[PDB]
Write a structure and sequence with these properties.
The structure is cut from a larger assembly and holds 2 copies of chain A. The first copy, chain A, is an all-alpha fold. In chain A, about 70% of the residues lie in helices and about 0% in strands. The PDB classes it as viral protein.
Chain lengths: ~50, ~50
């Protein structure tokens, strides 16, 4: 049961990570794409990617 | 008589928050018929996604 639980936990952490801003003004790519244009979005995109 | 920098400016500001609930303040994007069971783009009240 240990190993199964461990993998479950790891994957859950991994996926949950997605919903964090990391200092970007959002947590959704398509969002920033909608409300922002390249010369100013690229920085938020970079933050998120890192 | 003073400079333009010393002339009064009629100034405004548009504060508006984002992404809580389906609002009632947004643009003239024209709705269209719904269709199901085909993975397609969408935009519901602002919420995008595929």
């Amino acid at each position: 049961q240990d190993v199964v639980n461990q993998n479950a936990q790891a994957l859950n952490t991994l996926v949950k990570q997605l919903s964090s801003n990391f200092g970007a003004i959002s947590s959704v790519l398509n969002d920033i794409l909608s409300r922002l244009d390249p010369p100013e979005a690229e920085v938020q995109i970079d933050r998120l990617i890192t | 008589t003073n400079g333009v920098g010393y002339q009064p400016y009629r100034v405004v500001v548009l504060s508006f928050e984002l992404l809580h609930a389906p609002a009632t303040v947004c643009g003239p994007k024209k709705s269209t018929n719904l269709v199901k069971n085909k993975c397609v783009n969408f935009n519901f009240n602002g919420l995008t996604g595929t």
